[PDB]
Amino acid sequence: KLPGKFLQYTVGGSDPHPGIGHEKDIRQNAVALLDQSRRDMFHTVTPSLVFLCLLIPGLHAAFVHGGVPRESYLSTPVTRGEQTVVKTAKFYGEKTTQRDLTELEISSIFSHCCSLLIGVVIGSSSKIKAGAEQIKKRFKTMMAALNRPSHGETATLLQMFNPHEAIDWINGQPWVGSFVLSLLTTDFESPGKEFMDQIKLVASYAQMTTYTTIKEYLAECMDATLTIPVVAYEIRDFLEVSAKLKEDHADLFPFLGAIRHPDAIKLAPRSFPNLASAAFYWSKKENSTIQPGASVKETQLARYRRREISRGEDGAELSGEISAIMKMIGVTGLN
Amino acid sequence: KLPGKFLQYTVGGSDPHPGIGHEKDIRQNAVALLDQSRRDMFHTVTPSLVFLCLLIPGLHAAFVHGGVPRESYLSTPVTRGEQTVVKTAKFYGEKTTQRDLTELEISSIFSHCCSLLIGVVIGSSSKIKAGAEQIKKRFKTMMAALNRPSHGETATLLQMFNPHEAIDWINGQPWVGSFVLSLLTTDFESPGKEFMDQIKLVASYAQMTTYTTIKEYLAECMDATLTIPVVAYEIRDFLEVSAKLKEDHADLFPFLGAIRHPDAIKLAPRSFPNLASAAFYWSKKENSTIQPGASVKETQLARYRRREISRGEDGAELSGEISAIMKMIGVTGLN
Amino acid sequence: KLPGKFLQYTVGGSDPHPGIGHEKDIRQNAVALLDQSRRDMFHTVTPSLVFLCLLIPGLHAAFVHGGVPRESYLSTPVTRGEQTVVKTAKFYGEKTTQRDLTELEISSIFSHCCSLLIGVVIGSSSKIKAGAEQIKKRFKTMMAALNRPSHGETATLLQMFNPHEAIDWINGQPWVGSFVLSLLTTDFESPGKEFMDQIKLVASYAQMTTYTTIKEYLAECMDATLTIPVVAYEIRDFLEVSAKLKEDHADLFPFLGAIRHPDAIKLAPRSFPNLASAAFYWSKKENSTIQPGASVKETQLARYRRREISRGEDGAELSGEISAIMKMIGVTGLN
Amino acid sequence: KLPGKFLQYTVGGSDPHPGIGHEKDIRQNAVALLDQSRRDMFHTVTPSLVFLCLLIPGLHAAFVHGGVPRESYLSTPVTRGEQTVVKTAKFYGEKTTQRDLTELEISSIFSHCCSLLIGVVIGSSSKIKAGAEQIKKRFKTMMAALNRPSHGETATLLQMFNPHEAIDWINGQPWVGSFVLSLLTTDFESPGKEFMDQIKLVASYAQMTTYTTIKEYLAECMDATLTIPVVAYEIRDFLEVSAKLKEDHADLFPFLGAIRHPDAIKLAPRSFPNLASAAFYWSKKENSTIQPGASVKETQLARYRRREISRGEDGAELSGEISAIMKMIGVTGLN
């Protein structure tokens, strides 16, 4: 037999980290980091953090307060001075032919940050690494709202720089919730207003998929699974818990998941194991559902699913006008 | 709190751009750009534009009129003459061993342009970057119509050159609609006729997915969602709006989306929010549907979906002949 | 308006081609081409053709007869002798430290050829480039039949050499059908017998998806779409056409698609447009279906789909024994 | 005709192999192999085996006993000493600036080994090469159980080193079953306990998909396919065979597939061809099903699927309390 020993955690390690440079250098750093060969010189996450600082004045000092270093690790150390240098707080080159950003570069930085912040609000880089056509659609909507619809297609100067590493890095920081809260609650001047309109749409019920799946089930289920006593008792509790959270949080309620608020856990599967099991069961059949703690069984869900409930009757005769409209599409009446 | 400031657009930027060279050089440019190492020297979109110019005589002057530059940016500037050169209007090398295209090179250029133009008509590069087996099938159909079916498999000389960047670039230009209109309405000599036969099939109802999803719903839905009053009133309006557009546009009606005609928006979800909600609901159940502006609810759609409508009865007895045919497959009658 | 001119095919072009070398050199070529750096020196398809020649003695002379060149193009020409060399009929290096194949190299060549030939029989490289877990399962079954099950996992020496280009190239050659026919009808000694057992399973009804989808529909459809007169008349014709082809082709009938036999077209959608429309409609609903030439409509298919047919009744009471078995799983009877 | 000859297996081949180095060098090897440029010097599987040895004290001697070599092949031989060296049993460099692992490096090694061992227990690398969001979720659960939830996002130091080759290699070794058994049955100290909690969840019914699909069918199927006599007779046998295996194997029963126990084959499709056909049929319709040896037909399954069975009635009236709860979601009663 193996002895049952296992690798133990050490204490104390410097690992490579990204940085944000100095506030006065934000624009110069951003311009330099538009070039792939420059990005190759630093921790991969650094340019994304610098672009966010450029996007949102005031954000650099907030990151500093959260413990984000000014210095980025270098891709390769420089044994330059008898001493070995592994990091720096400046990312622009000696050849300092300072120029300003073009319009298309600005839109491209918007595109990169749009994907990045979508990943941060949903708590995952999986869709940005992959599921990206929905993301581009949001970006195109933004660009049209800003009267630059062609840029929805053409602002691709950062297309090879995927933000996935920066999504993961920000998602692991203790201040991620506060950062999202600040984005959702700040009244930004244009074009920030239009940028945040898209992030807010994405953030609504983000990381509250148990809540929204249950609500869908309660609104749309047409079968008797809703009536299974342990399910029904949890429906009442869920609606009451939800109402209390809505009263407490008001307009932030749809954002509890996105801001990593501790109350979001009150609407997790573990809080309503039988109802979550029933709703997940229904939702997979409509498009391993039994939750830890649930006493309801799959065989019971199957049997009750075959029985119908009613949500009221609306009249057994169509109006003359609706009958005529039905004839336009080859429908003769109710059956 | 963040102050609410946001990055502002600048005015005035030269960014890198592709080019089309000179009309007299189209074939020589195209031959040179069949080589990957030559393509690496220029903006990625340039060869696709040059291949289109080769495909369609007259297109080069149309692009010029639309503001497409003759000069392409170079991948790397040349500090050659005390002056720094960033672009050129010629893409063939000094070593000018001019040769003609082979048959297989022509078919390969057809393949590249086929994918490219499919992306342009559908308004997206997502399928070409990925969903490509349907595209190859169209290309194989073309090659068979041109009595070269083996080339459907073998014309792969440009297989590593994906047109996705050129789809996006063309899709962002103000003249994209006019370009598609000109392709759909020009009577091309062979082999252009056969090439355009495939593009026309793809362009039919392209970017009119709300229109076609509603039409599918109106033809195929067998439930009472069609009878919900706010839905039914929009069915009548939709059919009448559609008839008016059909009268106005005649044979171009299926191409309004592909040509980016302003009337296409008259058949967008926003124009029929309740009907679009109902049709999207139905279509996802048959294969977030509530549209901005809709008053219909998911719970109402669910309840009405459970009730059947009729599209007429066709007789309760099979003919003797159809009964006999049914016996051939083990069917005993109607039930 | 564009003038309607289009790029015309030229006549006469040498393009690069793969080769098969000389028969006496098959094994030496194969051993040399197990190394990626050697494969990089030649047309990408060459090693796959050489491995097939190694797999199947006699195949080299058949390829020669089909017009396959002995010489492969080189990745890079050699201006070596005042004359420029673009191709060669030998693929092994000057440093001719001739060795024999290992067992694991043989299994790895089997793996590569297994994927390759699956792509050839199905007429597509799309699954091999991508959909590969089903392929590995076939390969593992082969390796177990040959009493080397570990090689199902470990025979990965050619894992980075995907056969997709060679699938496409062979699929475009005029002799592809004859090649598949010869593979399916030759009685191979072991381990060829076991290799071909897997290819035969894959080849069965390959590229006869219209035939098999219709047969599925006729066996499994429980609705009245089968009774629509234009559909029913084509059901009778289809069964009779199919019976005639079965009589004519006997044990080759399931292989007509795989061998590219002209009779396969007799079972294409165009031959039974209404039945194919009905079967495709059914099959998409069970898992753009209207075929060119069909008169049946989607709205008619929808309406008839809602009516049930019967395939006979089997008794309204369970036997005592089957009732008891039903109690073991919580089933109380028929409903 | 081809003669029917086929390539024959040779006997006797040295192929490249990974290694595990020496026990005293495990940590030094692991630290050196955290660097990609060092990993590039050796067989790709070597670092994964070394990381496993670091993870689990005692595992190195078990691998040695199973025939795992100490020496790894080198990516490139060194003609260094008049003699040619192809392998070595040490993987750390001459420049032996020995350091200890950081916390984040430990978590990153946990991440790599988590994916690796998931692939080993499920018997496939396909999901790890691809289907990875479910894997990250397991890793995040682990990291939270170990009070380091940020590492669920940030422990990415080995993110570019996918374990797929090492999954395949271990999966092909004769001792893979014993290795998994030892992992599942050893009582590991923390953090091994928490690591193995995730592997055990994944290993439960791993590679017993026929067993679990049949059990799902027997619990959830609401149609008369269960009553088809050849199916029903196999239901009884299956439940009895399963009960016997449960008695024999007790808490190991869910792990028979994961440990490659010979009894797992007693629950393969071939053992219950008709029931497996029925369950696979049902399962594809609920989300080529006829098994070798089955006499049941798809047309019979279709017909019986249309008839309902009952699993008992539970009362035709809701309690007053459940009626009130139903009113909260717009449900008026049973229908």
Side-chain angles (χ1 to χ4, degrees), chain A residues 1-79 81 83-316 318-335, chain B residues 1-79 81 83-316 318-335, chain C residues 1-79 81 83-316 318-335, chain D residues 1-79 81 83-316 318-335:
Chain A
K1 198 154 225 191
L2 298 173
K5 300 194 285 205
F6 209 85
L7 182 55
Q8 296 302 307
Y9 277 101
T10 49
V11 334
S14 81
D15 309 289
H17 55 76
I20 55 170
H22 294 292
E23 188 168 327
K24 71 186 289 183
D25 293 339
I26 287 162
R27 190 172 292 239
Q28 195 172 4
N29 283 328
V31 169
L33 293 168
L34 287 171
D35 181 68
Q36 187 60 69
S37 71
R38 200 93 197 151
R39 292 197 298 276
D40 291 346
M41 297 174 182
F42 305 101
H43 192 289
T44 297
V45 168
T46 290
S48 290
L49 306 180
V50 171
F51 293 153
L52 288 170
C53 293
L54 179 74
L55 195 79
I56 299 172
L59 187 55
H60 185 274
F63 282 160
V64 164
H65 186 66
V68 182
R70 295 168 183 267
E71 295 77 22
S72 182
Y73 265 59
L74 296 160
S75 292
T76 30
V78 293
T79 314
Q83 317 295 302
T84 287
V85 176
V86 296
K87 65 191 182 172
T88 178
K90 71 184 189 3
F91 318 128
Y92 55 84
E94 169 170 42
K95 176 146 200 252
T96 291
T97 303
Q98 274 189 254
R99 62 169 185 91
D100 208 346
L101 298 160
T102 71
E103 276 174 61
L104 195 68
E105 288 169 339
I106 288 166
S107 291
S108 300
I109 288 170
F110 286 0
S111 177
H112 180 80
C113 291
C114 177
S115 294
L116 176 46
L117 292 176
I118 287 178
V120 171
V121 306
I122 70 178
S124 179
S125 55
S126 308
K127 296 223 201 92
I128 291 79
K129 255 170 308 210
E133 197 29 75
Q134 271 295 105
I135 288 159
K136 174 168 175 180
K137 284 188 186 172
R138 298 267 191 200
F139 178 64
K140 290 170 62 79
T141 298
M142 193 193 296
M143 290 295 103
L146 290 169
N147 299 129
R148 298 164 192 275
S150 61
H151 285 201
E153 300 289 347
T154 62
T156 54
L157 306 177
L158 294 177
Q159 67 179 340
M160 315 290 92
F161 182 30
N162 190 282
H164 72 112
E165 294 193 45
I167 296 164
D168 293 343
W169 186 91
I170 292 174
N171 281 349
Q173 306 309 308
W175 46 256
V176 61
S178 272
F179 169 54
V180 173
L181 176 63
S182 157
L183 298 181
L184 298 176
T185 55
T186 294
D187 179 29
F188 290 100
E189 72 187 339
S190 271
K193 187 266 185 192
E194 288 84 1
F195 184 105
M196 287 308 306
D197 279 346
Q198 298 312 309
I199 300 310
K200 288 171 188 181
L201 287 172
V202 174
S204 183
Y205 301 107
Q207 313 192 53
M208 298 177 68
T209 56
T210 294
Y211 176 76
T212 50
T213 292
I214 293 171
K215 289 291 284 184
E216 181 183 0
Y217 170 70
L218 302 185
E220 296 183 39
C221 176
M222 296 301 302
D223 69 58
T225 62
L226 296 160
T227 71
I228 293 166
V230 296
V231 176
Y233 306 143
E234 289 179 20
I235 294 176
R236 186 177 57 215
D237 194 46
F238 169 89
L239 290 172
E240 289 197 332
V241 165
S242 291
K244 292 171 99 172
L245 287 172
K246 277 174 173 188
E247 193 182 298
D248 190 52
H249 294 291
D251 283 342
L252 289 179
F253 176 75
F255 305 113
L256 296 174
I259 72 179
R260 285 70 166 177
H261 196 284
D263 281 348
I265 196 94
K266 293 179 178 154
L267 298 169
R270 215 195 51 87
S271 301
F272 309 95
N274 299 290
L275 176 53
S277 295
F280 292 170
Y281 189 79
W282 174 84
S283 171
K284 96 170 177 215
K285 301 282 167 191
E286 292 294 310
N287 294 14
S288 168
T289 83
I290 304 296
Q291 294 303 299
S295 63
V296 72
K297 295 226 78 159
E298 303 93 314
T299 190
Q300 191 179 12
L301 293 172
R303 141 175 122 248
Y304 278 75
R305 179 176 168 82
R306 278 297 162 157
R307 291 176 212 143
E308 281 197 79
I309 57 72
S310 174
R311 287 178 185 273
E313 240 275 280
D314 287 82
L318 303 179
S319 76
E321 181 173 18
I322 292 170
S323 292
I325 298 175
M326 291 302 93
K327 289 185 245 107
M328 303 171 80
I329 58 166
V331 170
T332 55
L334 295 162
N335 195 40
Chain B
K1 198 154 225 191
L2 298 173
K5 300 194 285 205
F6 209 85
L7 182 55
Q8 296 302 307
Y9 277 101
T10 49
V11 334
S14 81
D15 309 289
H17 55 76
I20 55 170
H22 294 292
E23 188 168 327
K24 71 186 289 183
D25 293 339
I26 287 162
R27 190 172 292 239
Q28 195 172 4
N29 283 328
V31 169
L33 293 168
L34 287 171
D35 181 68
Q36 187 60 69
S37 71
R38 201 93 197 151
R39 292 197 298 276
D40 291 346
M41 297 174 182
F42 305 101
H43 192 289
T44 297
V45 168
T46 290
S48 290
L49 306 180
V50 171
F51 293 153
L52 288 170
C53 293
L54 179 74
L55 195 79
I56 299 172
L59 187 55
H60 185 274
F63 282 160
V64 164
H65 186 66
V68 182
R70 295 168 183 267
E71 295 77 22
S72 182
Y73 265 59
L74 296 160
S75 292
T76 30
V78 293
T79 314
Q83 317 295 302
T84 287
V85 176
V86 296
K87 65 191 182 172
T88 178
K90 71 184 189 3
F91 318 128
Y92 55 84
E94 169 170 42
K95 176 146 200 252
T96 291
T97 303
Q98 274 189 254
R99 62 169 185 91
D100 208 346
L101 298 160
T102 71
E103 276 174 61
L104 195 68
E105 288 169 339
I106 288 166
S107 291
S108 300
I109 288 170
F110 286 0
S111 177
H112 180 80
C113 291
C114 177
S115 294
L116 176 46
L117 292 176
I118 287 178
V120 171
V121 306
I122 70 178
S124 179
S125 55
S126 308
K127 296 223 201 92
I128 291 79
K129 255 170 308 210
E133 197 29 75
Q134 271 295 105
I135 288 159
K136 174 168 175 180
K137 284 188 186 172
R138 298 267 191 200
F139 178 64
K140 290 170 62 79
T141 298
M142 193 193 296
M143 290 295 103
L146 290 169
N147 299 129
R148 298 164 192 275
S150 61
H151 285 201
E153 300 289 347
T154 62
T156 54
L157 306 177
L158 294 177
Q159 67 179 340
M160 315 290 92
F161 182 30
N162 190 282
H164 72 112
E165 294 193 45
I167 296 164
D168 293 343
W169 186 91
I170 292 174
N171 281 349
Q173 306 309 308
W175 46 256
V176 61
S178 272
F179 169 54
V180 173
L181 176 63
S182 157
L183 298 181
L184 298 176
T185 55
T186 294
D187 179 29
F188 290 100
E189 72 187 339
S190 271
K193 187 266 185 192
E194 288 84 1
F195 184 105
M196 287 308 306
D197 279 346
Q198 298 312 309
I199 300 310
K200 288 171 188 181
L201 287 172
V202 174
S204 183
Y205 301 107
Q207 313 192 53
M208 298 177 68
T209 56
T210 294
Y211 176 76
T212 50
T213 292
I214 293 171
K215 289 291 284 184
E216 181 183 0
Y217 170 70
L218 302 185
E220 296 183 39
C221 176
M222 296 301 302
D223 69 58
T225 62
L226 296 160
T227 71
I228 293 166
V230 296
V231 176
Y233 306 143
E234 289 179 20
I235 294 176
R236 186 177 57 215
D237 194 46
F238 169 89
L239 290 172
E240 289 197 332
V241 165
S242 291
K244 292 171 99 172
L245 287 172
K246 277 174 173 188
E247 193 182 298
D248 190 52
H249 294 291
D251 283 342
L252 289 179
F253 176 75
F255 305 113
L256 296 174
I259 72 179
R260 285 70 166 177
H261 196 284
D263 281 348
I265 196 94
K266 293 179 178 154
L267 298 169
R270 215 195 51 87
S271 301
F272 309 95
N274 299 290
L275 176 53
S277 295
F280 292 170
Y281 189 79
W282 174 84
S283 171
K284 96 170 177 215
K285 301 282 167 191
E286 292 294 310
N287 294 14
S288 168
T289 83
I290 304 296
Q291 294 303 299
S295 63
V296 72
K297 295 226 78 159
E298 303 93 314
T299 190
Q300 191 179 12
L301 293 172
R303 141 175 122 248
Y304 278 75
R305 179 176 168 82
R306 278 297 162 157
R307 291 176 212 143
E308 281 197 79
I309 57 72
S310 174
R311 287 178 185 273
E313 240 275 280
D314 287 82
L318 303 179
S319 76
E321 181 173 18
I322 292 170
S323 292
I325 298 175
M326 291 302 93
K327 289 185 245 107
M328 303 171 80
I329 58 166
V331 170
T332 55
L334 295 162
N335 195 40
Chain C
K1 198 154 225 191
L2 298 173
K5 300 194 285 205
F6 209 85
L7 182 55
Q8 296 302 307
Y9 277 101
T10 49
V11 334
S14 81
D15 309 289
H17 55 76
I20 55 170
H22 294 292
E23 188 168 327
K24 71 186 289 183
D25 293 339
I26 287 162
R27 190 172 292 239
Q28 195 172 4
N29 283 328
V31 169
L33 293 168
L34 287 171
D35 181 68
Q36 187 60 69
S37 71
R38 201 93 197 151
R39 292 197 298 276
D40 291 346
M41 297 174 182
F42 305 101
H43 192 289
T44 297
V45 168
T46 290
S48 290
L49 306 180
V50 171
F51 293 153
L52 288 170
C53 293
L54 179 74
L55 195 79
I56 299 172
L59 187 55
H60 185 274
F63 282 160
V64 164
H65 186 66
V68 182
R70 295 168 183 267
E71 295 77 22
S72 182
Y73 265 59
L74 296 160
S75 292
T76 30
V78 293
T79 314
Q83 317 295 302
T84 287
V85 176
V86 296
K87 65 191 182 172
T88 178
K90 71 184 189 3
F91 318 128
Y92 55 84
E94 169 170 42
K95 176 146 200 252
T96 291
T97 303
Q98 274 189 254
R99 62 169 185 91
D100 208 346
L101 298 160
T102 71
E103 276 174 61
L104 195 68
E105 288 169 339
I106 288 166
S107 291
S108 300
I109 288 170
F110 286 0
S111 177
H112 180 80
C113 291
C114 177
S115 294
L116 176 46
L117 292 176
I118 287 178
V120 171
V121 306
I122 70 178
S124 179
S125 55
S126 308
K127 296 223 201 92
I128 291 79
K129 255 170 308 210
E133 197 29 75
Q134 271 295 105
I135 288 159
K136 174 168 175 180
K137 284 188 186 172
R138 298 267 191 200
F139 178 64
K140 290 170 62 79
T141 298
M142 193 193 296
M143 290 295 103
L146 290 169
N147 299 129
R148 298 164 192 275
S150 61
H151 285 201
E153 300 289 347
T154 62
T156 54
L157 306 177
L158 294 177
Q159 67 179 340
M160 315 290 92
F161 182 30
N162 190 282
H164 72 112
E165 294 193 45
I167 296 164
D168 293 343
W169 186 91
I170 292 174
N171 281 349
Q173 306 309 308
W175 46 256
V176 61
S178 272
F179 169 54
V180 173
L181 176 63
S182 157
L183 298 181
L184 298 176
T185 55
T186 294
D187 179 29
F188 290 100
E189 72 187 339
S190 271
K193 187 266 185 192
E194 288 84 1
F195 184 105
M196 287 308 306
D197 279 346
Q198 298 312 309
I199 300 310
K200 288 171 188 181
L201 287 172
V202 174
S204 183
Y205 301 107
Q207 313 192 53
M208 298 177 68
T209 56
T210 294
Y211 176 76
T212 50
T213 292
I214 293 171
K215 289 291 284 184
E216 181 183 0
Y217 170 70
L218 302 185
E220 296 183 39
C221 176
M222 296 301 302
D223 69 58
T225 62
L226 296 160
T227 71
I228 293 166
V230 296
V231 176
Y233 306 143
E234 289 179 20
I235 294 176
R236 186 177 57 215
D237 194 46
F238 169 89
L239 290 172
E240 289 197 332
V241 165
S242 291
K244 292 171 99 172
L245 287 172
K246 277 174 173 188
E247 193 182 298
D248 190 52
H249 294 291
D251 283 342
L252 289 179
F253 176 75
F255 305 113
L256 296 174
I259 72 179
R260 285 70 166 177
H261 196 284
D263 281 348
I265 196 94
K266 293 179 178 154
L267 298 169
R270 215 195 51 87
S271 301
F272 309 95
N274 299 290
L275 176 53
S277 295
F280 292 170
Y281 189 79
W282 174 84
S283 171
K284 96 170 177 215
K285 301 282 167 191
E286 292 294 310
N287 294 14
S288 168
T289 83
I290 304 296
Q291 294 303 299
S295 63
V296 72
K297 295 226 78 159
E298 303 93 314
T299 190
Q300 191 179 12
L301 293 172
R303 141 175 122 248
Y304 278 75
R305 179 176 168 82
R306 278 297 162 157
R307 291 176 212 143
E308 281 197 79
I309 57 72
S310 174
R311 287 178 185 273
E313 240 275 280
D314 287 82
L318 303 179
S319 76
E321 181 173 18
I322 292 170
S323 292
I325 298 175
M326 291 302 93
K327 289 185 245 107
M328 303 171 80
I329 58 166
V331 170
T332 55
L334 295 162
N335 195 40
Chain D
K1 198 154 225 191
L2 298 173
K5 300 194 285 205
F6 209 85
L7 182 55
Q8 296 302 307
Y9 277 101
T10 49
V11 334
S14 81
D15 309 289
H17 55 76
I20 55 170
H22 294 292
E23 188 168 327
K24 71 186 289 183
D25 293 339
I26 287 162
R27 190 172 292 239
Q28 195 172 4
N29 283 328
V31 169
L33 293 168
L34 287 171
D35 181 68
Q36 187 60 69
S37 71
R38 201 93 197 151
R39 292 197 298 276
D40 291 346
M41 297 174 182
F42 305 101
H43 192 289
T44 297
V45 168
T46 290
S48 290
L49 306 180
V50 171
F51 293 153
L52 288 170
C53 293
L54 179 74
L55 195 79
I56 299 172
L59 187 55
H60 185 274
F63 282 160
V64 164
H65 186 66
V68 182
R70 295 168 183 267
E71 295 77 22
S72 182
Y73 265 59
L74 296 160
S75 292
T76 30
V78 293
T79 314
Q83 317 295 302
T84 287
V85 176
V86 296
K87 65 191 182 172
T88 178
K90 71 184 189 3
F91 318 128
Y92 55 84
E94 169 170 42
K95 176 146 200 252
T96 291
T97 303
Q98 274 189 254
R99 62 169 185 91
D100 208 346
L101 298 160
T102 71
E103 276 174 61
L104 195 68
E105 288 169 339
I106 288 166
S107 291
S108 300
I109 288 170
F110 286 0
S111 177
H112 180 80
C113 291
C114 177
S115 294
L116 176 46
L117 292 176
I118 287 178
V120 171
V121 306
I122 70 178
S124 179
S125 55
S126 308
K127 296 223 201 92
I128 291 79
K129 255 170 308 210
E133 197 29 75
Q134 271 295 105
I135 288 159
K136 174 168 175 180
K137 284 188 186 172
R138 298 267 191 200
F139 178 64
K140 290 170 62 79
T141 298
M142 193 193 296
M143 290 295 103
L146 290 169
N147 299 129
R148 298 164 192 275
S150 61
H151 285 201
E153 300 289 347
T154 62
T156 54
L157 306 177
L158 294 177
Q159 67 179 340
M160 315 290 92
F161 182 30
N162 190 282
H164 72 112
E165 294 193 45
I167 296 164
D168 293 343
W169 186 91
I170 292 174
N171 281 349
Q173 306 309 308
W175 46 256
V176 61
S178 272
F179 169 54
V180 173
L181 176 63
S182 157
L183 298 181
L184 298 176
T185 55
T186 294
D187 179 29
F188 290 100
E189 72 187 339
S190 271
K193 187 266 185 192
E194 288 84 1
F195 184 105
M196 287 308 306
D197 279 346
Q198 298 312 309
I199 300 310
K200 288 171 188 181
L201 287 172
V202 174
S204 183
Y205 301 107
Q207 313 192 53
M208 298 177 68
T209 56
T210 294
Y211 176 76
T212 50
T213 292
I214 293 171
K215 289 291 284 184
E216 181 183 0
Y217 170 70
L218 302 185
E220 296 183 39
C221 176
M222 296 301 302
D223 69 58
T225 62
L226 296 160
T227 71
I228 293 166
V230 296
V231 176
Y233 306 143
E234 289 179 20
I235 294 176
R236 186 177 57 215
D237 194 46
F238 169 89
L239 290 172
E240 289 197 332
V241 165
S242 291
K244 292 171 99 172
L245 287 172
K246 277 174 173 188
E247 193 182 298
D248 190 52
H249 294 291
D251 283 342
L252 289 179
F253 176 75
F255 305 113
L256 296 174
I259 72 179
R260 285 70 166 177
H261 196 284
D263 281 348
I265 196 94
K266 293 179 178 154
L267 298 169
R270 215 195 51 87
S271 301
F272 309 95
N274 299 290
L275 176 53
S277 295
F280 292 170
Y281 189 79
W282 174 84
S283 171
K284 96 170 177 215
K285 301 282 167 191
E286 292 294 310
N287 294 14
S288 168
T289 83
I290 304 296
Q291 294 303 299
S295 63
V296 72
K297 295 226 78 159
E298 303 93 314
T299 190
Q300 191 179 12
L301 293 172
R303 141 175 122 248
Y304 278 75
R305 179 176 168 82
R306 278 297 162 157
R307 291 176 212 143
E308 281 197 79
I309 57 72
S310 174
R311 287 178 185 273
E313 240 275 280
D314 287 82
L318 303 179
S319 76
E321 181 173 18
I322 292 170
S323 292
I325 298 175
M326 291 302 93
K327 289 185 245 107
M328 303 171 80
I329 58 166
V331 170
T332 55
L334 295 162
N335 195 40

